[PDB]
Design a binder for this molecule. Sequence first.
Ligand code: CLA
Ligand code: CLA
Ligand code: CLA
Ligand SMILES: CC(C)=CCC/C(C)=C/CC/C(C)=C/CC/C(C)=C/CC/C(C)=C/CC/C(C)=C/CC/C(C)=C/CC/C(C)=C/CC/C(C)=C/CC1=CC(=O)C(C)=C(C)C1=O
Ligand SMILES: CCCCCCCCCCCCCCCC(=O)OC[C@H](COP(=O)(O)OC[C@@H](O)CO)OC(=O)CCCCCCCCCCCCCCC
Ligand SMILES: CC1=C(/C=C/C(C)=C/C=C/C(C)=C/C=C/C=C(C)/C=C/C=C(C)/C=C/C2=C(C)CCCC2(C)C)C(C)(C)CCC1
Ligand SMILES: CC1=C(/C=C/C(C)=C/C=C/C(C)=C/C=C/C=C(C)/C=C/C=C(C)/C=C/C2=C(C)CCCC2(C)C)C(C)(C)CCC1
Ligand SMILES: CCCCCCCCCCCCO[C@@H]1O[C@H](CO)[C@@H](O[C@H]2O[C@H](CO)[C@@H](O)[C@H](O)[C@H]2O)[C@H](O)[C@H]1O
Ligand SMILES: CCCCCCCS[C@@H]1O[C@H](CO)[C@@H](O)[C@H](O)[C@H]1O
Ligand SMILES: [Ca+2]
Ligand SMILES: [Fe+2]
Ligand SMILES: [Mg+2]
Lengths: 342, 38, 57, 30, 81, 64, 33, 34, 38, 34, 504, 34, 57, 36
Amino acid sequence: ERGWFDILDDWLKRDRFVFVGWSGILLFPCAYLALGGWLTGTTFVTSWYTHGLASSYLEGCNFLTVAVSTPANSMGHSLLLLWGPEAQGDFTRWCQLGGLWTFIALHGAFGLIGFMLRQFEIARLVGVRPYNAIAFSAPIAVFVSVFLIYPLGQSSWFFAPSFGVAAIFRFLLFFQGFHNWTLNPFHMMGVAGVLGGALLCAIHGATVENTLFQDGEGASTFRAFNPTQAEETYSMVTANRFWSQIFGIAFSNKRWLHFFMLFVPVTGLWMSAIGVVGLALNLRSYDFISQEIRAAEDPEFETFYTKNLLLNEGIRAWMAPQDQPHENFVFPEEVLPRGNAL
Amino acid sequence: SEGGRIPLWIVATVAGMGVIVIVGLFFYGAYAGLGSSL
Amino acid sequence: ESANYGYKFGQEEETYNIVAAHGYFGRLIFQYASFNNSRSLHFFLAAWPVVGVWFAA
Amino acid sequence: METITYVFIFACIIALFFFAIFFREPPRIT
Amino acid sequence: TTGERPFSDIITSVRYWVIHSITIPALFIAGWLFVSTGLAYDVFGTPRPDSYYAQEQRSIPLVTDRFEAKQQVETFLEQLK
Amino acid sequence: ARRTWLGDILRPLNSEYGKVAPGWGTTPLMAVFMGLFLVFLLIILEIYNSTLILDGVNVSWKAL
Amino acid sequence: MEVNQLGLIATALFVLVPSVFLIILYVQTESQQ
Amino acid sequence: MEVNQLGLIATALFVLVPSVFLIILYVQTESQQK
Amino acid sequence: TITPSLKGFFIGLLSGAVVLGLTFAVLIAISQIDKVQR
Amino acid sequence: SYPIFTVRWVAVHTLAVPTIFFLGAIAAMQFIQR
Amino acid sequence: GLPWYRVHTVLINDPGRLIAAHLMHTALVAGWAGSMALYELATFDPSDPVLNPMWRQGMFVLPFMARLGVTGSWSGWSITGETGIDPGFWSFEGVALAHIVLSGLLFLAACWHWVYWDLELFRDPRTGEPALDLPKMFGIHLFLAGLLCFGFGAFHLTGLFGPGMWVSDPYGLTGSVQPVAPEWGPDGFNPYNPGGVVAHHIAAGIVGIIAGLFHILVRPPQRLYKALRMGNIETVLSSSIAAVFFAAFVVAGTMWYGSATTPIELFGPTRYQWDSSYFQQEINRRVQASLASGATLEEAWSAIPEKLAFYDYIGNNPAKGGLFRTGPMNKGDGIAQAWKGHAVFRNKEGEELFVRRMPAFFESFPVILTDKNGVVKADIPFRRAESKYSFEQQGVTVSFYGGELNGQTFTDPPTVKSYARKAIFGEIFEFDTETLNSDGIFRTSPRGWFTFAHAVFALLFFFGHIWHGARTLFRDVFSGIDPELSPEQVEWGFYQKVGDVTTR
Amino acid sequence: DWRVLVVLLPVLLAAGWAVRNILPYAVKQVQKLL
Amino acid sequence: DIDGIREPVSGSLLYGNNIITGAVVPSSNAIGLHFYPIWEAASLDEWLYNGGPYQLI
Amino acid sequence: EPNPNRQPVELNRTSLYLGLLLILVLALLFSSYFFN
Ligand code: CLA
Ligand code: CLA
Ligand code: CLA
Ligand SMILES: CC(C)=CCC/C(C)=C/CC/C(C)=C/CC/C(C)=C/CC/C(C)=C/CC/C(C)=C/CC/C(C)=C/CC/C(C)=C/CC/C(C)=C/CC1=CC(=O)C(C)=C(C)C1=O
Ligand SMILES: CCCCCCCCCCCCCCCC(=O)OC[C@H](COP(=O)(O)OC[C@@H](O)CO)OC(=O)CCCCCCCCCCCCCCC
Ligand SMILES: CC1=C(/C=C/C(C)=C/C=C/C(C)=C/C=C/C=C(C)/C=C/C=C(C)/C=C/C2=C(C)CCCC2(C)C)C(C)(C)CCC1
Ligand SMILES: CC1=C(/C=C/C(C)=C/C=C/C(C)=C/C=C/C=C(C)/C=C/C=C(C)/C=C/C2=C(C)CCCC2(C)C)C(C)(C)CCC1
Ligand SMILES: CCCCCCCCCCCCO[C@@H]1O[C@H](CO)[C@@H](O[C@H]2O[C@H](CO)[C@@H](O)[C@H](O)[C@H]2O)[C@H](O)[C@H]1O
Ligand SMILES: CCCCCCCS[C@@H]1O[C@H](CO)[C@@H](O)[C@H](O)[C@H]1O
Ligand SMILES: [Ca+2]
Ligand SMILES: [Fe+2]
Ligand SMILES: [Mg+2]
């Protein structure tokens, strides 16, 4: 049977400069639209009616302060389809209501699905094991938990991260002040995975480059390697002795070593994702009850834990009126928490 | 027509200088008009 | 059995096929975004986090 | 109670370091 | 190789540069005019420097209803005199 | 293997391992039901979301 | 300090049950030929 | 009832520690060849 | 009753059918013109 | 010898064409005064 | 030998011992439900369904028994407050006991199937190899699922032969188990219409019967069989896990937003009812209707049911807890005893003032009082030296209407500030904090815990689907790639179509 | 709206100028693939 | 007394810290950048009050 | 009637050390939150 399906399959899987595949039907429009929405919004679109903020190059923002901001809190979790009941097909209103944010987030989610299908598709055609796709589950867990589950647990899309540099920084600080997110053991595991992964990246790369075999005569050692050679280009035996004597332990199995490099950052990102699912519900690691009972009763008891909560209380009181304009917070000067003099 | 006429190093040099021109214009704008704080 | 027993400490021959990896990863993006020289690939792995952390410091 | 727990766990880790370094499986070339 | 013409071949060819010495500046100028005619403001609904606030108000025209949001913006836009 | 009264009764039900229909079989019909199911999920999603609003369908506790 | 007192047995079983699992598997591997 | 709270962990370790010792010894006996 | 949003729902359905339809139409066409050699 | 209109040609221009238009729009913004 | 993370693969080709393992898992899950129900019955206080309902007590499986009609105990009480009832055998205790007995029967069955693993039924009659005809098994199991689905909706929920399900008014005041008729019109797809729940199970069950018959009688197309590896049991694991995490996300969402199957009297209020002052608006409407009908302020508020006031309190908001604040909500703010009544604040001019309520985002919140127009008129200052709005300067007093403080007025600043601090939480209640040694810090309800566990499990099971899907489609390279992989298959140009050697 | 024509006109003249310079080879590429 | 204002901060396990809240606390702001070895203190009790251990570590 | 699907299980010494380190470190991390 060589019908139209098989002929289409032939054309999608041609060896061209940019491979396409069946997955490309999903991947390329969604990725291109998510990127184009972000460039269109950060260049031309305001956040005046949703946030009270300028947020485009047109308005005078720079690369650090442009964003595609989230919709107004009054939109709830509306899909904000262009043809939906809020914008009613009006492209200009849709931009002013925050429709580009759901546009980017949803096309981005489906584009990420498409990229992982592409990793599966190409791996099956070339005949490799699909571990690259498996590792990519970690960026997807992060994107889905932070950009979709988290606002879905909260009151509206407004509290999702906005798509911009400084807007993401605001997201970090909001998470410290309101959620005490540095205290969360699921974030801690995420930190260990990301920093541990950076560590492994550097130490593996440096170790290889400094246990090279002399396989050529030039002082530039890059030329002395051939992709089809059968021999290892560096000495695992010398690498093993160096690290055993420097650090006490060393890798001896090169397959274990490279599985471990996959395992560590991937597991870290997955752990951070679980913690953010908790924060969707305000299920925080905010306090240690034993510390609060002692400190309530003993005004001489002070730890770095109690010092940081005072900082969180400052963040909340000082940023909430501007950061949550729909709430209409009016905090007179006299109620604002402040230390001496400052 | 046939690829090869214009040497690549001149292509690279002209394209590079256009990049510098357009990025310098953006930094100029940080101090004038909108977004300049003035 | 664990695939890790398929590598033996000190063996002379490489334990994976870099040409297959490059053929997969070159098609994922495009051919020239992929390394086929293990030495320069590993130099890149060393350089990127080290330079970034120098800037952080 | 809780102080004893924290220090006990810590002390086990330092013991584990000792055996992992000095009583490791020896790497053997072939 | 995958059969397409090499990029270094194309971008050093006179014919490429005959074509793109026109198409590139023409797009650039189209983008400039999109802003300079003021069309960008009206397509996307972005305030001009004189239309964030009315002359004496200092409150944001914040959207507060879901299904009448479109009409709320239009009302805010009238009140700009 | 061990035969049992109940296994003999159930034997026909585990006897066609590997038996397929030629070619594409009923795949196009399956595709039609999948498409209908996708529109169905979209309808109930957007009702819950208040993106699709229907007469007499009040998406609220106030519907008891 | 008024800590949760179940914290002690919770920590103790958290260490002991998976650690014991690993020790059983390891020792019976050594005892094989 | 106002029982001693340490009775729980005392009883749990009393059961678990010598039980685990026996299980270790048994399982490594079974896996010795033949 | 056809509410405005139910009308909007049908417009969304038709638009997506048109987009998917043209996409596969063009793709099937091109695959028939530029076949692989076996 | 080579074709002119390939998939690669389309992918290049779906990115390159809007990029240049946007650079011209942003260049103009540098002369807007309040 | 096998690595520790693969020990269970010995069942892949052993259907009898697979059934045994699946029987043992089922025995464990049933035994958990029985033992969880007994624990909850030993700790549940039935004596106050108004201010101490099950969801204040950390009850997790009790609401699930009540949802489908189990409401009474053999000791004579019911969760709706009745005494002297006879629930028959299907009390909370009878349900727990039945699950315990089922657990033990399934344990014995698991032993039989483990020992007698080599049954002729599991062998292919042509080859004698172990083999399961998964496409036909699917139609048999789907057919049984359709019958069960249909009978659940047609007989249990309608009350035709069964008790029905829990239903209530929009404010969660008068819930009970009632027979429910199906809703066949478009409102049947309204999540808050219990009638749609009945219609769904009748209709989907019929569809499941029909589709089950189809999958019993029609073999899979050769093209789908090869593409989905329908001879490989691991393909069923991969798609089953996908269906399961789909379902888990849905039950997490409907628990968090609310629906006819997650009533507030069983799981507590939703966070969104606090965000939109859902209960506060109903309270105010009833007080208007009384004031309009000539009653005094004290009669209007005293007519508000305590159960309705208790819903208008942030301590019952499931978005106020913490991950390691364990136990029932009663362990936090205490066991609620009585509505204190509605606090009305006035300044020295006699203007009524209103306390700004705490949004769920804030662990703490300042105390700020406005007039009807949202103008700040009083607050509790942090820096005193330039205070202008202090309660002392503004002559703030508080009067109570309804509840136990009905008719009283307080004027001393310390007492007035005390009640204003409580008023940021909504209605004000008296709590017993001694019985459980409550610590005064908010915990989440079973609605919050259910949602968290199931969103987390749904996300993890997504990884399971990816992993087992990958093992199904790449079984041939699980141990490594072909040692004789030709460089030409992976270098560019040699083949026109990637991975197709016939297109050199 | 005249600004729409002012903006598209530089793009439209660019499309027709590249078509002049490429149509001999474009027709030749389409002919070869037939 | 990290900030030199006679307001001591508790950092150790035996004084009410767990693993997450505990610290060795920086030396006092009254010392600034002055070198503070054990032998510059009148006693160990003084050295500990002023955060001597931080410098040594 | 011996079942043919049985297989020996292994945990090598390095895996024991890695496993024990993971469990001890997880305990050291989570214990503070258990005591609260
Ligand atoms: C090809 C991949 C792809 C995918 C997966 C998506 C996905 C999406 N788009 Mg995007 N989009 C795409 C390409 C894609 N788009 C392209 C190429 C363009 C340029 C035109 C756009 C421009 C665009 C805009 C302007 C918007 C979206 C929006 C969306 C979202 C809502 C879509 C929807 O409800 O349609 C529903 C339609 C279908 C599911 C089609 C299925 C048809 C069925 C299967 C067949 C049966 C139909 C039948 C024949 C018709 C009966 C009709 C009759 C009863 C009247 C969704 C995330 C919306 C959004 O982002 O909201 C913020 C939105 O406003 N898209
Ligand atoms: C869906 C599962 C589920 C849910 C939602 C509930 C919900 C509830 N339970 Mg129940 N329970 C369950 C299953 C569940 N239970 C099971 C399986 C058991 C048997 C153990 C119990 C036994 C039980 C008892 C004995 C009690 C409850 C109680 C409660 C209530 C308080 C919960 C609480 O404080 O948790 C606190 C939650 C946490 C502290 C979260 C733990 C986070 C874990 C430890 C993180 C682990 C991380 C891991 C190590 C990292 C791995 C990393 C690695 C992969 C690299 C709440 C209504 C209490 C109650 O009020 O009864 C009236 C009560 O006394 N439950
Ligand atoms: C219906 C669910 C289901 C079933 C019948 C299976 C079955 C299997 N899995 Mg899959 N898997 C699942 C879901 C399932 N899995 C999910 C949700 C995930 C993502 C977390 C995975 C991720 C996964 C991986 C990465 C691997 C498997 C592997 C396997 C195979 C060997 C497992 C083994 O020996 O573990 C032995 C496990 C132990 C001896 C101890 C595990 C202890 C855990 C971590 C903590 C304790 C859990 C607790 C007791 C129960 C919690 C219940 C929970 C639902 C609340 C077996 C075919 C393996 C395989 O493919 O082999 C070739 C393999 O590598 N699975
Ligand atoms: C209406 C519509 C659109 C319909 C479409 C339907 C359809 C059929 C479309 C097809 C037609 C088509 C193609 C349209 C195109 C549209 C279009 C242009 C879409 C574009 C979408 C888009 C721009 C996506 C952007 C994606 C993106 C940003 C990619 C970035 C890639 C990037 C930055 C890569 C650099 C990173 C890099 C080099 C990393 C290497 C470092 C690293 C450690 C490697 C490790 C490593 C490497 C090895 O190398 C080997 C060896 C080994 C050992 C090894 O360790
Ligand atoms: C030349 C300028 C380099 C400045 C920074 C240093 C980068 C290289 C050091 C990384 C250390 C990693 C650990 C050792 C890893 C290790 O062992 O390296 C080994 C690797 C190969 O060594 P060879 O012996 O083959 O060659 C080096 C000499 O021996 C001369 O041949 O060294 C190099 O490649 C040197 C490259 C110099 C040229 C690099 C220029 C990079 C500049 C790029 C611009 C960055 C700007 C970013 C702005 C955001
Ligand atoms: C949204 C939307 C859409 C779409 C659109 C699109 C698709 C767009 C695209 C767009 C685009 C696509 C754009 C682009 C742009 C670009 C740019 C703007 C760039 C710039 C650059 C630069 C500036 C650079 C810089 C640099 C760097 C970065 C580094 C190197 C050096 C230098 C300095 C050069 C539609 C219609 C569908 C619908 C509606 C909505
Ligand atoms: C034999 C017999 C019997 C008996 C039976 C019985 C007695 C049973 C019981 C059973 C039971 C009594 C069971 C139980 C079970 C349980 C379970 C199965 C559990 C599990 C758990 C879990 C799994 C958990 C987990 C966790 C933790 C711990 C922490 C947090 C997180 C989580 C949740 C994960 C009778 C007489 C009937 C008759 C016949 C014979
Ligand atoms: C409270 C927490 C406790 C957690 C409980 C943990 C239970 C784990 C049980 C592990 C059991 C391992 O099971 C054990 O496997 C080994 C091999 O691996 C089997 O051993 C078998 O293979 C070996 C290997 O050559 C042969 O030499 C041997 O003669 C044969 O019997 C044992 O017969 C069985 O006892
Ligand atoms: C100054 C103390 C008395 C003034 C009234 C205080 C607010 S009311 C008070 O709040 C307590 C929680 O803080 C509850 O436990 C208690 O039941 C309730 O009476
Ligand atoms: Ca001016
Ligand atoms: Fe490497
Ligand atoms: Mg400027």
